[PDB]
C-alpha cells in the first residue's frame, strides 16, 4: 500500500556549485604515479547543482510537507547527501516506473544492501517507514511501502551495505556521502565515497575522489530516478493516509554529468589525488594544454578546450515516400543470372525495417558503407540488379571473388561501394518437378568486364573444329538450367540476390534514410547532419553563390565549409567551432591565480562572437568583457589593466606591449597585487 502527497508549501529549490567534488576513476585500468588526460563523462567544476530538502521539518512550529520529485537521469548523475539518521535509504531507476517497463531498486533496510531488477509497479510517492521501535511491532521489520507488486524479475544482488550507518548525532550533519551513477554499455556503475564532515550546509570547496563500488550487469533503459526516504516517526505513516511526513531533517544535492576533458593525477597507490577541469577557466586550460599542475611565469599558447558542441541537428529532404522494397523483393519471379534486371531506385526513403516480417536475409554484406550508418545516409543514385542463383554460388557475389558466376555471369567490380543482400527462396520459385526456368551461362570465350551483361545465345567453340550452329561433339550450348526441385539440400536451393550500388556525390539527394529532420540552429555550435554528411561547427547565413545542382562547397583543402539546406534551399556557411589565438599570461601558479587573456588579432567587440561566450562557463564570460578592455595591435588583452608608465619588459605579449605582476597593493588604497600591461 501507499499514501498520497497533499503538499502545498512547495517552493522552487535552491542551487549550489559543485566546486571540485565529483571526480571518479573513469576506467578499470590501473595507473600509478601518472598524469592522464581523459575526456569521459565528468561533473564540471563549479557546476550548477540542485538542492532538495525532501521533507519539511515539523520542529519549526510544525510543517508536514513532503517533496520527493522525479528527476531525469541524463547520462550520469552525481548524488550528495548530508543527513545522519539514514533518512535517505536507497533509489529507484527506470523509464516509466510502472509495471509496463523493468526498473531498478536499491534498498538498505538493514546492515546489508539489496538490489533488484524486477518490474515493480511503483506508487506515486514511494517511501520507507518502520525502522526500529521495540514493543510496537516495529523492531527489525522489513516492510516495503514502495511497490504494489513485482513480477518477471531478472537480477537480484544482496551484499554488504554501502557505508556505515547509525551514529545519530543531531545538529552535525556528519558523514557526507557522495555517489555517481552511470549507465553505459548495459553496465550500471556506482562509485561511492563518504567523508566525516561537520559543517551545517554549503558543501565545502574540497576535492573528493570517488572509488568504484559496484558494476551491475543489469542492462536496462534508465532515464528517470527518484530518492527513497525513511519516513518513520516510530512507524510508517501513522493514523490515516499522510500525517506521517515527520522524519527529522533531509537534504540531497543532484548534479548532472556532461562530457568534459580532465587531467586526473594518480599517486603511487593508484588513487586520484588532484584533477583539472579543462573547461573552467584559462588557468585550467593552460594547465591542460601542457599537461602539468604547476605553471610557471610567462605566456602560453593554449589548445582549444572551451566550447563543446551540445546540440545535434538533422536536415534531410522532405520526401515522405516509402521505397518499393515490397514491390521488388516480393516479386513473382526474378530474372535469371545471365540476364539480370537493372532497376533505378529513386525518390525513396529506404526504410529497411519494413523488410523484417517478410524474409530473413542470409547475407547483408555491405562494401564501402557500414551497415550501421545506413539509416542516416542520403544517396544520389541507387540500382537494384536482382537475380536468382544457386546457394553455393552466393559467395561468388563479391568484388575480389572468382568463379563461374563471377567470371561468366556478373563480375562485380572492385569498387562496388554498395550492399549485397541475399536470401533463400526455396519456397517461392522451386515448384515441384523442377523449375528449370532460371538459366545460367556456363561457357564463354573470355571473362566478363564489371557490370556487363551477355545475352549471347551462340555456340561455344569448345573444340578445335568449327561446327556452325549445331551441337556437335565439342560444341555445347552455352546456357543451362539449374532445376529447383523442392527436395535438394541447401546447397542447391534458389537464393535471390539484390546488389544495391550507392553513389554519394555533390548532387541533390534522391534515396535517403528513415531518419527524420529537426530544427535549424543558425548561430550556435552544433553537430549538423545534412544530406549524408555530418560535421561539427557553427552555421551562419551567407551570400555564397551556388550552382543549381550543387549541394556543398569545400574549403581550400577538401573541407566542406558551405552546405545548402535541403529543406529551404538556402545557402549556409560552416565556420569551425574553435578560435585558436588565445594566449594566457600567468605570473606562475606559485605566485598568484589571476591570469590575462590575449585573443589573437581581434578587437574587443567580436570576442564574445569569436569565442562563443554564450556557450561558455561564467568564469570564461568574466574573461570575455569587463573593465580591463585594453586593446593592442595583436588583438586586445582582456584581463589586465593598462598603465601609462614605461617600465622594463617582464613578460613579452605582442607588438610593443608587455605585462608584469606588480605589488600595487601598497600604491593602491584597496586593490592588491595585480597584472599590468605597459609599453616596453
Amino acid at each position: 500500500q501507499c499514501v498520497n502527497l497533499t503538499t502545498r508549501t512547495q517552493l522552487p529549490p535552491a542551487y549550489t556549485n559543485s566546486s571540485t567534488r565529483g571526480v571518479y576513476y573513469p576506467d578499470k585500468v590501473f595507473r600509478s604515479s601518472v598524469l592522464h588526460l581523459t575526456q569521459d563523462l565528468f561533473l564540471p567544476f563549479f557546476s550548477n547543482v540542485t538542492w532538495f530538502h525532501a521533507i519539511h521539518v515539523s520542529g519549526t512550529n510544525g510543517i508536514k510537507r513532503f517533496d520527493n520529485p522525479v528527476l531525469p537521469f541524463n547520462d550520469g548523475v552525481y548524488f550528495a547527501s548530508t543527513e545522519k539518521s539514514n533518512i535517505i535509504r536507497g533509489w529507484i531507476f527506470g523509464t516509466t516506473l510502472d509495471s509496463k517497463t523493468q526498473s531498478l531498486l536499491i534498498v538498505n533496510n538493514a546492515t546489508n544492501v539489496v538490489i533488484k531488477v524486477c518490474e515493480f509497479q511503483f506508487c506515486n510517492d514511494p517511501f520507507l517507514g518502520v525502522y526500529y521501535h521495540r514493543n510496537n511491532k516495529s523492531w527489525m521489520e522489513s516492510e516495503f511501502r514502495v511497490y504494489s507488486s513485482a513480477n518477471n524479475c531478472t537480477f537480484e544482488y544482496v551484499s554488504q551495505p554501502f557505508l556505515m550507518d547509525l551514529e545519530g548525532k543531531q545538529g552535525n550533519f556528519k558523514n557526507l556521502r557522495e555517489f555517481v551513477f552511470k549507465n553505459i554499455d548495459g553496465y550500471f556503475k556506482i562509485y561511492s565515497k563518504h567523508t566525516p564532515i561537520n559543517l551545517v550546509r554549503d558543501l565545502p570547496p574540497g576535492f573528493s575522489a570517488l572509488e568504484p563500488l559496484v558494476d551491475l550487469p543489469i542492462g536496462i533503459n534508465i532515464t528517470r530516478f527518484q530518492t527513497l526516504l525513511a519516513l518513520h516517526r516510530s512507524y510508517l505513516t501513522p493514523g490515516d493516509s499522510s500525517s506521517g511526513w515527520t522524519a527529522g531533517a533531509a537534504a540531497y544535492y543532484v548534479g548532472y554529468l556532461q562530457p568534459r576533458t580532465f587531467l586526473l593525477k594518480y599517486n603511487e597507490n593508484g588513487t586520484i589525488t588532484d584533477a583539472v577541469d579543462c573547461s573552467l577557466d584559462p588557468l585550467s586550460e593552460t594547465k591542460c594544454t601542457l599537461k602539468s599542475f604547476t605553471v610557471e611565469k610567462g605566456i602560453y599558447q593554449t589548445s582549444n578546450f572551451r566550447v563543446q558542441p551540445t546540440e545535434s541537428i538533422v536536415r534531410f529532404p522532405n520526401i515522405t515516400n516509402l521505397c518499393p522494397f515490397g514491390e521488388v523483393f516480393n516479386a513473382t519471379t526474378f530474372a535469371s543470372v545471365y540476364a539480370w534486371n537493372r532497376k533505378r531506385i529513386s525518390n525513396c526513403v529506404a526504410d529497411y525495417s519494413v523488410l523484417y516480417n517478410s524474409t530473413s536475409f542470409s547475407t547483408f554484406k555491405c562494401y564501402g558503407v557500414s551497415p550501421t550508418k545506413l539509416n542516416d545516409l542520403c544517396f544520389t543514385n541507387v540500382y537494384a540488379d536482382s537475380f536468382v542463383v544457386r546457394g553455393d554460388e552466393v559467395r561468388q557475389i563479391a568484388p575480389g571473388q572468382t568463379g563461374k558466376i563471377a567470371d561468366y555471369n556478373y563480375k562485380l567490380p572492385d569498387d562496388f561501394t554498395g550492399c549485397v543482400i541475399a536470401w533463400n527462396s526455396n519456397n517461392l520459385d522451386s515448384k515441384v518437378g523442377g523449375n528449370y526456368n532460371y538459366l545460367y551461362r556456363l561457357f564463354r570465350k573470355s571473362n566478363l568486364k564489371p557490370f556487363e551483361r551477355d545475352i549471347s545465345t551462340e555456340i561455344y567453340q569448345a573444340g578445335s573444329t568449327p561446327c556452325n550452329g549445331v551441337e556437335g561433339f565439342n560444341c555445347y550450348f552455352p546456357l543451362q538450367s539449374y532445376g529447383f526441385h523442392p527436395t535438394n539440400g541447401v546447397g542447391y536451393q534458389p537464393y535471390r540476390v539484390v546488389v544495391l550500388s550507392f553513389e554519394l556525390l555533390n548532387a541533390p539527394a534522391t534515396v535517403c534514410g528513415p531518419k527524420k529532420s529537426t530544427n535549424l540552429i543558425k548561430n550556435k555550435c552544433v553537430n549538423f547532419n545534412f544530406n549524408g554528411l555530418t560535421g561539427t561547427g557553427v552555421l551562419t547565413e551567407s551570400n555564397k553563390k551556388f550552382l543549381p545542382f550543387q549541394q556543398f562547397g569545400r574549403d581550400i583543402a577538401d573541407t566542406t565549409d558551405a552546405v545548402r539546406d535541403p529543406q529551404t534551399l538556402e545557402i549556409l556557411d560552416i565556420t569551425p567551432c574553435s578560435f585558436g589565438g588565445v594566449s594566457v599570461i600567468t605570473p606562475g601558479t606559485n605566485a598568484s591565480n589571476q591570469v590575462a587573456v590575449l585573443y589573437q588579432d581581434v578587437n574587443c567587440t567580436e570576442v564574445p562572437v569569436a569565442i562563443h561566450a554564450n556557450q561558455l562557463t561564467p568564469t570564461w564570460r568574466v574573461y570575455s568583457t569587463g573593465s580591463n578592455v585594453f586593446q593592442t595591435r595583436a588583438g586586445c588583452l582582456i584581463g589586465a589593466e593598462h598603465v601609462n608608465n614605461s617600465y622594463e619588459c617582464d613578460i613579452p605579449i605582442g607588438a610593443g606591449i608587455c605585462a608584469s605582476y606588480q605589488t600595487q597593493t601598497n600604491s593602491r588604497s584597496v586593490a592588491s597585487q595585480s597584472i599590468i600591461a605597459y609599453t616596453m
Binding site: 564501402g368 558503407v369 557500414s370 551497415p371 550501421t372 550508418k373 542516416d376 545516409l377 554519394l504 547532419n529 549524408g532 554528411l533 555530418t534 560535421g535 581550400i556 583543402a557 577538401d558 573541407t559 566542406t560
Partner: protein, 99 residues
C-alpha cells in the same frame, strides 16, 4: 630586396603547403574526416582515421623540422649581422672586405 624577401616567401610557402597537404589521402578512402565519420562506423572507420592522423602528424613533423633548419640559418645570419653592427657601426674594422 633579394634574400630579405626570400625568407618571408619561404615561410609563407611552407604554411601554404601545410594547408595544401591536408588533401592528401595518406591511404585512407577519402581525405575528409567528416566523410569517413559519416560513411563508416567507429570500429571500421578507426583504421582510416589513424591513417589520416599518422599522415597529418608526419606532415606537421616535417614542417617543424624545416622551420628548425630555417631558424638555424636565420640565427647564423643574425649573428653575422650583430657582429657587423657591433664592429662596423660602433667602431672601425681593419678586416679586409668585411664591410
Amino acid at each position: 630586396l633579394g634574400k630579405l624577401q626570400d625568407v618571408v616567401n619561404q615561410n609563407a610557402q611552407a604554411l601554404n603547403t601545410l594547408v595544401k597537404q591536408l588533401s592528401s589521402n595518406f591511404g585512407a578512402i577519402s581525405s575528409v574526416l567528416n566523410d569517413i565519420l559519416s560513411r563508416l562506423d567507429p570500429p571500421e572507420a578507426e583504421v582510416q582515421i589513424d591513417r589520416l592522423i599518422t599522415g597529418r602528424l608526419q606532415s606537421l613533423q616535417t614542417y617543424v623540422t624545416q622551420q628548425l633548419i630555417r631558424a638555424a640559418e636565420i640565427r647564423a645570419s643574425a649573428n653575422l649581422a650583430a657582429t657587423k653592427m657591433s664592429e662596423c657601426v660602433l667602431g672601425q674594422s681593419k678586416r679586409v672586405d668585411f664591410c
